[PDB]
Amino acid sequence: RFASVYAWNRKRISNCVADYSVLYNLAPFFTFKCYGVSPTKLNDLCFTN
Amino acid sequence: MESEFRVYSSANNCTFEYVSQPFLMDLEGKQGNFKNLREFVFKNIDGYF
């Protein structure tokens, strides 16, 4: 169950190794639309949170 | 006893959460012969605590 529009829940991610391979390797990901950052090159880009 | 387990009725705005290993929690205690010498240097350098 996900939240509503104005009650959008916020998640905090810190001090862990993220993995975007599931976003890329899995076939059922038929919808992946990105402009701001490089889709495939986001693996090497590190965020602060 | 661990009375007053509730401080807030609802969670308004929480930002940071951290989990690590449990510290050396010594149950009860003894008066005199203060064996525990706890020396802690707290520093904050370029964001890192």
Side-chain angles (χ1 to χ4, degrees):
Chain A
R1 282 293 295 107
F2 274 143
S4 181
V5 179
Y6 63 91
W8 51 279
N9 59 6
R10 163 141 285 191
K11 258 46 163 180
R12 302 317 200 75
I13 307 299
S14 293
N15 294 293
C16 63
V17 176
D19 203 341
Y20 286 101
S21 304
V22 285
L23 176 74
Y24 185 80
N25 288 129
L26 272 296
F29 279 95
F30 308 113
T31 318
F32 176 74
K33 180 265 290 181
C34 197
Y35 316 94
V37 290
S38 312
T40 66
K41 201 210 75 183
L42 205 58
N43 297 319
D44 273 15
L45 303 185
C46 280
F47 304 153
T48 182
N49 46 5
Chain B
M1 283 73 74
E2 40 180 359
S3 180
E4 293 104 8
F5 56 92
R6 182 95 282 162
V7 289
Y8 61 97
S9 57
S10 72
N12 187 256
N13 193 359
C14 292
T15 57
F16 187 79
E17 288 93 7
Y18 179 73
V19 172
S20 71
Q21 63 294 310
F23 201 71
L24 184 61
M25 189 143 277
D26 316 303
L27 189 62
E28 310 300 318
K30 179 248 291 181
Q31 197 177 353
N33 190 179
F34 293 100
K35 204 76 67 177
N36 296 126
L37 185 61
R38 279 189 168 119
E39 303 168 50
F40 307 130
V41 175
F42 315 89
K43 301 206 303 189
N44 49 2
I45 299 173
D46 53 339
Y48 278 62
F49 204 94

XYZ file of all heavy atoms in Angstrom:
813
model
N 0.839 -1.190 0.000
C 0.000 0.000 0.000
C 0.876 1.242 0.000
O 1.778 1.370 0.834
C -0.932 0.013 1.215
C -2.141 -0.898 1.086
C -3.085 -0.394 0.010
N -3.669 0.894 0.362
C -3.332 2.046 -0.203
N -2.417 2.105 -1.156
N -3.925 3.165 0.200
N 0.609 2.153 -0.930
C 1.318 3.421 -1.008
C 0.449 4.552 -0.472
O -0.768 4.419 -0.323
C 1.747 3.724 -2.446
C 3.063 3.105 -2.829
C 3.265 2.607 -4.104
C 4.105 3.041 -1.918
C 4.477 2.043 -4.460
C 5.317 2.476 -2.267
C 5.503 1.979 -3.540
N 1.095 5.675 -0.180
C 0.419 6.820 0.415
C -0.420 7.535 -0.643
O -0.487 7.133 -1.808
C 1.439 7.754 1.060
N -1.082 8.613 -0.233
C -1.869 9.434 -1.140
C -0.980 10.525 -1.734
O 0.244 10.515 -1.574
C -3.081 10.015 -0.416
O -3.864 10.807 -1.293
N -1.590 11.488 -2.423
C -0.814 12.516 -3.114
C -0.218 13.499 -2.114
O 1.006 13.613 -1.980
C -1.684 13.237 -4.156
C -0.881 14.318 -4.859
C -2.250 12.242 -5.155
N -1.077 14.221 -1.391
C -0.595 15.245 -0.470
C 0.016 14.653 0.790
O 0.790 15.337 1.469
C -1.730 16.203 -0.108
C -2.879 15.562 0.635
C -2.901 15.517 2.022
C -3.951 15.014 -0.055
C -3.954 14.935 2.701
C -5.009 14.431 0.615
C -5.007 14.396 1.992
O -6.060 13.815 2.661
N -0.307 13.405 1.119
C 0.276 12.714 2.264
C 1.417 11.802 1.838
O 1.602 10.717 2.396
C -0.796 11.926 3.010
N 2.187 12.226 0.838
C 3.273 11.411 0.311
C 4.286 11.102 1.403
O 4.906 12.009 1.965
C 3.949 12.130 -0.856
C 4.355 13.544 -0.553
C 3.556 14.650 -0.574
C 5.662 14.002 -0.188
N 4.284 15.767 -0.243
C 5.580 15.396 -0.001
C 6.895 13.369 0.001
C 6.681 16.166 0.366
C 7.987 14.136 0.365
C 7.874 15.519 0.542
N 4.446 9.818 1.709
C 5.422 9.412 2.708
C 6.842 9.635 2.202
O 7.115 9.555 1.001
C 5.196 7.951 3.108
C 5.294 6.988 1.935
O 5.637 7.369 0.818
N 4.983 5.723 2.191
N 7.743 9.949 3.124
C 9.139 10.202 2.802
C 9.998 9.078 3.362
O 9.829 8.679 4.518
C 9.592 11.549 3.367
C 11.101 11.719 3.436
C 11.508 13.129 3.053
N 11.406 13.354 1.617
C 11.891 14.415 0.989
N 12.519 15.377 1.643
N 11.742 14.512 -0.328
N 10.911 8.570 2.543
C 11.835 7.524 2.949
C 13.244 8.089 3.043
O 13.646 8.925 2.228
C 11.806 6.348 1.969
C 11.009 5.150 2.462
C 9.669 5.575 3.036
C 8.713 4.401 3.136
N 7.396 4.810 3.696
N 13.986 7.634 4.045
C 15.354 8.068 4.280
C 16.301 6.916 3.979
O 16.133 5.815 4.513
C 15.539 8.539 5.723
C 14.628 9.681 6.133
C 14.533 10.740 5.051
N 14.078 12.017 5.586
C 14.831 12.840 6.303
N 16.091 12.553 6.589
N 14.307 13.979 6.745
N 17.288 7.170 3.126
C 18.298 6.185 2.765
C 19.660 6.755 3.130
O 20.006 7.863 2.706
C 18.235 5.829 1.270
C 16.817 5.408 0.882
C 19.224 4.727 0.945
C 16.325 4.184 1.616
N 20.426 6.004 3.918
C 21.726 6.484 4.359
C 22.590 5.307 4.783
O 22.093 4.320 5.332
C 21.590 7.481 5.514
O 20.960 8.675 5.085
N 23.894 5.435 4.522
C 24.903 4.480 4.985
C 24.610 3.059 4.507
O 24.647 2.103 5.285
C 25.037 4.520 6.508
C 25.599 5.835 7.006
O 26.758 6.162 6.750
N 24.779 6.598 7.718
N 24.317 2.916 3.216
C 24.095 1.602 2.634
C 24.486 1.638 1.165
O 24.604 2.705 0.558
C 22.640 1.149 2.795
S 21.442 2.197 1.957
N 24.690 0.452 0.601
C 25.100 0.308 -0.791
C 23.850 0.063 -1.630
O 23.259 -1.019 -1.579
C 26.117 -0.826 -0.962
C 26.447 -1.023 -2.433
C 27.377 -0.532 -0.163
N 23.445 1.069 -2.398
C 22.293 0.928 -3.272
C 22.634 0.037 -4.463
O 23.799 -0.154 -4.818
C 21.815 2.296 -3.756
N 21.592 -0.520 -5.077
C 21.754 -1.404 -6.229
C 20.670 -1.078 -7.245
O 19.494 -1.382 -7.020
C 21.688 -2.874 -5.816
C 22.371 -3.789 -6.812
O 22.569 -3.366 -7.969
O 22.714 -4.930 -6.439
N 21.064 -0.467 -8.359
C 20.147 -0.163 -9.447
C 20.081 -1.274 -10.484
O 19.386 -1.119 -11.494
C 20.553 1.146 -10.129
C 20.229 2.385 -9.328
C 21.213 3.035 -8.593
C 18.944 2.908 -9.307
C 20.925 4.169 -7.859
C 18.647 4.042 -8.575
C 19.643 4.668 -7.854
O 19.357 5.797 -7.122
N 20.791 -2.383 -10.264
C 20.767 -3.483 -11.222
C 19.379 -4.094 -11.337
O 18.957 -4.471 -12.436
C 21.785 -4.551 -10.822
O 23.083 -3.996 -10.699
N 18.658 -4.203 -10.218
C 17.293 -4.721 -10.260
C 16.414 -3.826 -11.123
O 15.535 -4.305 -11.850
C 16.732 -4.866 -8.833
C 17.343 -6.079 -8.149
C 17.000 -3.606 -8.022
N 16.641 -2.514 -11.062
C 15.923 -1.585 -11.925
C 16.277 -1.791 -13.393
O 15.453 -1.517 -14.274
C 16.227 -0.152 -11.493
C 15.656 1.010 -12.299
C 14.171 1.179 -12.035
C 16.417 2.275 -11.945
N 17.484 -2.279 -13.674
C 17.984 -2.432 -15.035
C 17.902 -3.861 -15.556
O 17.535 -4.069 -16.716
C 19.434 -1.941 -15.110
C 20.031 -1.943 -16.499
C 19.758 -0.918 -17.397
C 20.888 -2.958 -16.904
C 20.310 -0.916 -18.664
C 21.445 -2.964 -18.168
C 21.154 -1.941 -19.044
O 21.708 -1.946 -20.303
N 18.235 -4.854 -14.729
C 18.281 -6.234 -15.201
C 16.898 -6.855 -15.350
O 16.687 -7.673 -16.252
C 19.129 -7.087 -14.256
C 20.611 -6.787 -14.368
O 21.287 -6.551 -13.368
N 21.124 -6.797 -15.593
N 15.952 -6.493 -14.486
C 14.654 -7.155 -14.479
C 13.842 -6.790 -15.717
O 13.729 -5.615 -16.080
C 13.876 -6.796 -13.211
C 14.092 -7.654 -11.958
C 13.629 -9.084 -12.202
C 15.540 -7.634 -11.498
N 13.286 -7.812 -16.366
C 12.392 -7.588 -17.499
C 11.122 -6.816 -17.151
O 10.750 -5.924 -17.934
C 12.043 -8.932 -18.151
N 10.410 -7.092 -16.049
C 9.128 -6.401 -15.814
C 9.229 -4.885 -15.706
O 8.186 -4.221 -15.682
C 8.632 -7.012 -14.497
C 9.286 -8.340 -14.437
C 10.646 -8.126 -15.023
N 10.432 -4.314 -15.641
C 10.594 -2.860 -15.623
C 10.387 -2.324 -17.038
O 11.318 -1.901 -17.727
C 11.960 -2.476 -15.071
C 12.029 -2.481 -13.572
C 12.480 -3.596 -12.887
C 11.629 -1.372 -12.845
C 12.538 -3.602 -11.508
C 11.687 -1.372 -11.464
C 12.142 -2.489 -10.795
N 9.126 -2.347 -17.477
C 8.778 -1.856 -18.804
C 8.653 -0.341 -18.860
O 8.589 0.219 -19.959
C 7.467 -2.484 -19.278
C 7.449 -3.981 -19.201
C 6.604 -4.631 -18.319
C 8.268 -4.738 -20.020
C 6.583 -6.010 -18.249
C 8.253 -6.117 -19.955
C 7.410 -6.754 -19.068
N 8.614 0.332 -17.714
C 8.450 1.782 -17.657
C 9.595 2.365 -16.833
O 9.599 2.269 -15.602
C 7.094 2.159 -17.072
O 6.086 1.293 -17.605
C 6.749 3.597 -17.430
N 10.567 2.960 -17.523
C 11.678 3.662 -16.881
C 11.986 4.893 -17.724
O 12.549 4.775 -18.817
C 12.899 2.767 -16.736
C 14.090 3.476 -16.167
C 14.151 3.801 -14.825
C 15.150 3.827 -16.983
C 15.251 4.463 -14.312
C 16.248 4.483 -16.472
C 16.300 4.802 -15.135
N 11.623 6.065 -17.211
C 11.706 7.312 -17.958
C 12.480 8.338 -17.140
O 12.043 8.731 -16.054
C 10.299 7.803 -18.314
C 10.235 9.091 -19.104
C 10.031 10.268 -18.180
C 8.637 10.267 -17.586
N 8.421 11.434 -16.690
N 13.627 8.766 -17.668
C 14.556 9.655 -16.984
C 15.036 10.755 -17.920
O 15.333 10.497 -19.090
C 15.767 8.871 -16.460
S 16.748 9.717 -15.205
N 15.115 11.987 -17.405
C 15.814 13.041 -18.140
C 16.917 13.708 -17.330
O 17.973 14.017 -17.887
C 14.859 14.143 -18.640
C 13.568 13.666 -19.252
C 12.418 13.554 -18.488
C 13.479 13.402 -20.612
C 11.227 13.152 -19.051
C 12.292 12.983 -21.183
C 11.168 12.859 -20.396
O 9.979 12.449 -20.956
N 16.694 13.947 -16.035
C 17.611 14.785 -15.277
C 19.014 14.218 -15.183
O 19.998 14.956 -15.290
N 19.130 12.907 -14.983
C 20.418 12.246 -14.836
C 20.507 11.115 -15.852
O 19.510 10.696 -16.440
C 20.638 11.710 -13.408
C 20.842 12.863 -12.442
C 19.455 10.858 -12.982
N 21.723 10.626 -16.050
C 21.959 9.561 -17.016
C 21.372 8.253 -16.502
O 21.738 7.810 -15.405
C 23.452 9.408 -17.279
O 24.054 10.665 -17.529
N 20.457 7.616 -17.241
C 19.856 6.368 -16.739
C 20.873 5.294 -16.392
O 20.946 4.859 -15.236
C 18.953 5.925 -17.902
C 18.985 7.032 -18.924
C 19.671 8.209 -18.330
N 21.668 4.857 -17.367
C 22.596 3.756 -17.159
C 23.844 4.159 -16.389
O 24.462 3.302 -15.748
C 23.008 3.153 -18.505
O 23.766 4.113 -19.249
C 21.778 2.757 -19.305
N 24.226 5.434 -16.429
C 25.430 5.912 -15.769
C 25.165 6.364 -14.337
O 26.085 6.836 -13.662
C 26.056 7.046 -16.586
C 27.528 7.305 -16.304
C 27.871 8.769 -16.517
C 27.341 9.631 -15.384
N 27.614 11.078 -15.611
N 23.929 6.219 -13.856
C 23.615 6.576 -12.478
C 24.272 5.642 -11.470
O 24.350 5.987 -10.286
C 22.100 6.582 -12.274
C 21.592 7.466 -11.137
C 22.034 8.900 -11.359
C 20.078 7.378 -11.026
N 24.741 4.471 -11.908
C 25.383 3.539 -10.988
C 26.651 4.133 -10.389
O 26.905 3.991 -9.187
C 25.699 2.228 -11.706
C 24.455 1.519 -12.196
O 23.441 1.473 -11.503
N 24.529 0.960 -13.398
N 27.461 4.801 -11.209
C 28.715 5.372 -10.739
C 28.539 6.710 -10.036
O 29.504 7.214 -9.453
C 29.688 5.533 -11.910
C 30.504 4.283 -12.165
O 30.136 3.214 -11.633
O 31.510 4.367 -12.899
N 27.343 7.292 -10.071
C 27.084 8.579 -9.435
C 26.614 8.334 -8.005
O 25.667 7.576 -7.776
C 26.049 9.373 -10.229
C 26.395 9.634 -11.695
C 25.357 10.539 -12.346
C 27.789 10.233 -11.813
N 27.275 8.976 -7.047
C 26.941 8.819 -5.639
C 26.189 10.041 -5.130
O 26.603 11.181 -5.354
C 28.206 8.602 -4.805
S 28.846 6.911 -4.841
N 25.080 9.791 -4.441
C 24.275 10.835 -3.829
C 24.613 10.918 -2.348
O 25.119 9.961 -1.756
C 22.777 10.556 -3.993
C 22.343 10.365 -5.418
C 21.238 9.587 -5.712
C 23.051 10.937 -6.460
C 20.837 9.393 -7.017
C 22.653 10.748 -7.768
C 21.545 9.975 -8.045
N 24.340 12.077 -1.749
C 24.533 12.201 -0.310
C 23.407 11.547 0.479
O 23.646 11.041 1.581
C 24.684 13.670 0.082
O 24.910 13.765 1.494
C 23.459 14.470 -0.309
N 22.190 11.542 -0.059
C 21.064 10.823 0.524
C 19.936 10.805 -0.493
O 19.764 11.755 -1.261
C 20.589 11.456 1.838
C 20.464 12.958 1.750
O 20.641 13.547 0.688
N 20.153 13.590 2.875
N 11.713 0.916 36.963
C 10.908 0.480 35.834
C 10.973 1.515 34.719
O 11.189 2.706 34.963
C 9.452 0.251 36.248
C 9.216 -1.043 37.011
S 9.848 -0.974 38.697
C 8.625 0.080 39.472
N 10.782 1.047 33.488
C 10.828 1.914 32.311
C 9.461 2.556 32.064
O 8.799 2.331 31.051
C 11.305 1.121 31.099
C 10.737 -0.287 31.023
C 11.226 -1.051 29.809
O 11.990 -0.472 29.010
O 10.849 -2.231 29.658
N 9.046 3.374 33.027
C 7.779 4.078 32.925
C 7.894 5.242 31.941
O 8.988 5.668 31.559
C 7.332 4.579 34.298
O 6.098 5.271 34.215
N 6.733 5.757 31.532
C 6.634 6.857 30.572
C 7.323 6.495 29.254
O 8.299 7.119 28.832
C 7.201 8.154 31.160
C 6.395 8.711 32.318
C 7.055 8.459 33.658
O 8.210 7.983 33.671
O 6.420 8.734 34.698
N 6.791 5.462 28.607
C 7.310 4.984 27.333
C 6.798 5.787 26.143
O 7.262 5.565 25.020
C 6.957 3.502 27.143
C 5.485 3.208 27.238
C 4.690 3.201 26.102
C 4.897 2.934 28.462
C 3.337 2.930 26.187
C 3.543 2.661 28.552
C 2.763 2.659 27.412
N 5.860 6.705 26.360
C 5.276 7.513 25.297
C 5.547 8.981 25.586
O 5.243 9.469 26.680
C 3.772 7.260 25.180
C 3.084 8.037 24.066
C 2.957 7.216 22.791
N 4.203 7.155 22.037
C 4.465 6.256 21.098
N 3.588 5.319 20.774
N 5.635 6.298 20.468
N 6.124 9.680 24.609
C 6.332 11.114 24.712
C 5.495 11.899 23.704
O 5.045 13.005 24.024
C 7.828 11.470 24.572
C 8.596 11.018 25.802
C 8.413 10.842 23.319
N 5.272 11.364 22.507
C 4.527 12.046 21.459
C 3.319 11.213 21.051
O 3.415 9.990 20.906
C 5.415 12.316 20.237
C 5.974 11.067 19.589
C 5.358 10.499 18.482
C 7.122 10.460 20.081
C 5.867 9.359 17.887
C 7.637 9.321 19.494
C 7.008 8.775 18.397
O 7.520 7.642 17.809
N 2.178 11.885 20.872
C 0.970 11.190 20.441
C 1.056 10.785 18.974
O 0.567 9.716 18.590
C -0.257 12.069 20.685
O -0.129 13.317 20.028
N 1.666 11.626 18.141
C 1.836 11.337 16.725
C 3.203 11.829 16.271
O 3.775 12.751 16.858
C 0.731 11.985 15.878
O 0.896 13.391 15.807
N 3.722 11.200 15.219
C 5.030 11.547 14.665
C 4.841 12.688 13.675
O 4.305 12.496 12.581
C 5.677 10.335 14.007
N 5.285 13.886 14.060
C 5.106 15.059 13.209
C 6.196 15.149 12.145
O 5.909 15.124 10.943
C 5.084 16.328 14.065
C 4.729 17.564 13.264
O 5.597 18.374 12.933
N 3.449 17.717 12.947
N 7.455 15.257 12.570
C 8.567 15.415 11.633
C 9.814 14.813 12.274
O 10.396 15.411 13.184
C 8.778 16.879 11.272
C 9.695 17.063 10.077
O 10.203 16.093 9.514
N 9.914 18.312 9.685
N 10.214 13.638 11.795
C 11.457 12.993 12.192
C 12.386 12.921 10.989
O 11.952 12.605 9.877
C 11.201 11.590 12.747
S 10.319 11.572 14.321
N 13.668 13.215 11.213
C 14.624 13.362 10.123
C 15.635 12.223 10.066
O 15.772 11.575 9.026
C 15.352 14.707 10.242
O 15.987 14.795 11.523
C 14.370 15.858 10.090
N 16.351 11.958 11.154
C 17.445 10.999 11.126
C 17.173 9.808 12.035
O 16.586 9.939 13.111
C 18.763 11.658 11.535
C 19.959 10.770 11.356
C 20.526 10.593 10.105
C 20.512 10.104 12.435
C 21.626 9.774 9.936
C 21.612 9.285 12.271
C 22.169 9.119 11.021
N 17.615 8.637 11.579
C 17.527 7.398 12.341
C 18.823 6.626 12.154
O 19.327 6.523 11.032
C 16.334 6.550 11.887
C 14.983 7.109 12.294
C 14.369 7.985 11.220
O 14.931 8.041 10.105
O 13.326 8.618 11.489
N 19.359 6.089 13.246
C 20.613 5.350 13.199
C 20.536 4.081 14.036
O 19.924 4.056 15.104
C 21.787 6.194 13.684
C 23.089 5.440 13.667
C 23.735 5.159 12.470
C 23.667 4.992 14.844
C 24.924 4.462 12.448
C 24.855 4.300 14.832
C 25.480 4.033 13.633
O 26.666 3.340 13.618
N 21.188 3.031 13.544
C 21.263 1.745 14.228
C 22.699 1.246 14.151
O 23.353 1.368 13.110
C 20.292 0.713 13.612
C 20.527 -0.673 14.198
C 18.848 1.143 13.810
N 23.194 0.691 15.254
C 24.525 0.098 15.286
C 24.513 -1.070 16.263
O 23.457 -1.613 16.599
C 25.589 1.138 15.657
O 25.492 1.507 17.020
N 25.702 -1.480 16.693
C 25.820 -2.557 17.658
C 25.420 -2.070 19.050
O 25.548 -0.884 19.364
C 27.249 -3.100 17.693
C 28.320 -2.104 18.144
C 28.522 -0.951 17.176
O 28.695 -1.158 15.977
N 28.495 0.270 17.696
N 24.914 -2.963 19.897
C 24.613 -2.571 21.278
C 25.886 -2.342 22.078
O 26.880 -3.055 21.919
C 23.817 -3.763 21.822
C 24.251 -4.916 20.980
C 24.518 -4.353 19.615
N 25.844 -1.337 22.947
C 26.979 -1.038 23.799
C 27.017 -2.006 24.979
O 26.114 -2.824 25.179
C 26.916 0.413 24.282
C 28.241 0.964 24.730
C 29.239 1.235 23.809
C 28.485 1.217 26.070
C 30.458 1.742 24.215
C 29.704 1.725 26.482
C 30.691 1.988 25.552
N 28.085 -1.912 25.770
C 28.266 -2.777 26.934
C 27.310 -2.319 28.032
O 27.647 -1.525 28.914
C 29.715 -2.752 27.406
C 30.059 -3.698 28.559
C 29.798 -5.142 28.164
C 31.503 -3.511 28.996
N 26.083 -2.830 27.966
C 25.064 -2.507 28.956
C 25.190 -3.453 30.143
O 24.813 -4.628 30.053
C 23.670 -2.598 28.338
C 22.563 -2.067 29.233
S 21.275 -1.202 28.316
C 22.005 0.426 28.160
N 25.717 -2.944 31.253
C 25.913 -3.725 32.468
C 24.657 -3.604 33.324
O 24.303 -2.505 33.765
C 27.149 -3.246 33.229
C 28.341 -3.007 32.318
O 28.749 -3.950 31.609
O 28.869 -1.875 32.311
N 23.986 -4.729 33.553
C 22.766 -4.722 34.348
C 23.079 -4.419 35.809
O 24.045 -4.940 36.375
C 22.046 -6.066 34.232
C 20.641 -6.133 34.833
C 19.707 -5.163 34.128
C 20.096 -7.551 34.766
N 22.250 -3.574 36.413
C 22.416 -3.120 37.799
C 23.787 -2.449 37.921
O 24.279 -1.837 36.964
C 22.183 -4.276 38.759
C 20.895 -5.041 38.505
C 19.663 -4.163 38.623
O 19.602 -3.343 39.562
O 18.757 -4.291 37.771
N 24.414 -2.553 39.084
C 25.714 -1.948 39.281
C 26.165 -2.105 40.715
O 25.441 -2.625 41.571
N 27.385 -1.636 40.963
C 28.002 -1.734 42.275
C 28.600 -0.387 42.654
O 29.240 0.271 41.830
C 29.075 -2.830 42.296
C 29.792 -2.993 43.624
C 31.242 -2.562 43.507
C 32.019 -3.531 42.633
N 33.451 -3.155 42.514
N 28.381 0.016 43.905
C 28.874 1.289 44.411
C 30.301 1.124 44.918
O 30.586 0.220 45.708
C 27.969 1.812 45.528
C 28.146 3.290 45.834
C 27.186 3.781 46.900
O 26.288 3.056 47.325
N 27.377 5.017 47.345
N 31.188 2.000 44.463
C 32.595 1.905 44.787
C 33.363 1.072 43.775
O 32.801 0.286 43.013
N 34.683 1.253 43.784
C 35.581 0.597 42.835
C 35.109 0.849 41.401
O 34.697 -0.052 40.671
C 35.696 -0.902 43.140
C 36.790 -1.585 42.335
O 37.032 -2.784 42.478
N 37.454 -0.819 41.477
N 35.180 2.125 41.023
C 34.614 2.599 39.762
C 35.470 2.049 38.627
O 36.322 2.730 38.052
C 34.560 4.120 39.737
C 33.605 4.714 40.733
C 34.071 5.221 41.936
C 32.249 4.773 40.469
C 33.200 5.774 42.857
C 31.372 5.324 41.385
C 31.849 5.824 42.581
N 35.226 0.777 38.302
C 36.044 0.080 37.316
C 35.919 0.716 35.937
O 36.909 0.824 35.204
C 35.647 -1.395 37.263
C 36.736 -2.323 36.755
C 37.795 -2.571 37.816
C 37.232 -3.365 38.984
N 38.281 -3.666 39.998
N 34.715 1.146 35.571
C 34.459 1.679 34.237
C 35.125 3.042 34.097
O 34.711 4.014 34.737
C 32.959 1.780 33.983
C 32.279 0.429 33.982
O 31.309 0.209 34.707
N 32.784 -0.486 33.164
N 36.158 3.116 33.261
C 36.784 4.373 32.877
C 36.402 4.623 31.424
O 36.922 3.961 30.520
C 38.298 4.301 33.057
C 39.109 5.569 32.804
C 38.677 6.671 33.748
C 40.590 5.282 32.959
N 35.477 5.547 31.198
C 34.962 5.817 29.862
C 35.569 7.126 29.379
O 35.251 8.193 29.914
C 33.439 5.883 29.874
C 32.753 4.525 29.846
C 31.251 4.671 29.650
N 30.606 3.398 29.348
C 29.670 2.836 30.100
N 29.242 3.410 31.213
N 29.148 1.672 29.725
N 36.447 7.048 28.380
C 37.075 8.224 27.796
C 36.571 8.389 26.373
O 36.739 7.489 25.544
C 38.599 8.108 27.817
C 39.188 7.886 29.196
C 40.650 7.497 29.147
O 41.422 8.188 28.455
O 41.031 6.510 29.805
N 35.961 9.535 26.086
C 35.373 9.785 24.778
C 35.829 11.140 24.264
O 35.669 12.156 24.950
C 33.848 9.727 24.845
C 33.318 8.470 25.462
C 32.381 8.523 26.476
C 33.759 7.234 25.032
C 31.895 7.368 27.047
C 33.275 6.076 25.600
C 32.341 6.143 26.605
N 36.380 11.156 23.057
C 36.715 12.387 22.355
C 35.657 12.590 21.283
O 35.554 11.789 20.345
C 38.118 12.328 21.746
C 38.383 13.575 20.928
C 39.157 12.161 22.834
N 34.861 13.647 21.419
C 33.812 13.960 20.459
C 34.320 15.049 19.525
O 34.651 16.149 19.977
C 32.536 14.424 21.162
C 32.149 13.592 22.354
C 32.630 13.892 23.613
C 31.277 12.531 22.216
C 32.266 13.135 24.704
C 30.911 11.773 23.306
C 31.404 12.078 24.550
N 34.376 14.754 18.230
C 34.830 15.728 17.251
C 33.810 15.841 16.130
O 33.036 14.919 15.873
C 36.199 15.355 16.668
C 37.305 15.244 17.696
C 38.663 15.510 17.073
C 38.937 14.567 15.919
N 40.340 14.680 15.442
N 33.817 16.991 15.463
C 32.977 17.210 14.287
C 33.824 17.897 13.219
O 34.062 19.106 13.281
C 31.726 18.012 14.632
C 32.027 19.258 15.437
O 33.180 19.566 15.728
N 30.981 19.992 15.793
N 34.274 17.119 12.240
C 35.138 17.617 11.177
C 34.412 17.429 9.855
O 33.933 16.328 9.560
C 36.502 16.905 11.169
C 37.236 17.149 12.488
C 37.351 17.400 10.012
C 38.511 16.347 12.635
N 34.313 18.515 9.080
C 33.602 18.632 7.802
C 32.369 17.736 7.736
O 32.254 16.891 6.841
C 34.504 18.407 6.564
C 35.305 17.100 6.569
O 35.553 16.474 7.607
O 35.701 16.685 5.458
N 31.443 17.918 8.671
C 30.193 17.174 8.707
C 30.257 15.856 9.448
O 29.331 15.507 10.183
N 31.343 15.113 9.264
C 31.517 13.848 9.959
C 31.592 14.072 11.464
O 32.367 14.905 11.945
C 32.785 13.151 9.474
C 32.617 12.391 8.182
C 32.260 13.044 7.011
C 32.817 11.021 8.132
C 32.108 12.353 5.830
C 32.665 10.320 6.956
C 32.310 10.991 5.807
O 32.158 10.295 4.631
N 30.788 13.317 12.204
C 30.796 13.326 13.658
C 31.534 12.080 14.127
O 31.081 10.958 13.875
C 29.368 13.353 14.198
C 29.248 13.910 15.584
C 28.957 15.247 15.779
C 29.415 13.099 16.690
C 28.840 15.765 17.052
C 29.297 13.611 17.963
C 29.012 14.944 18.145
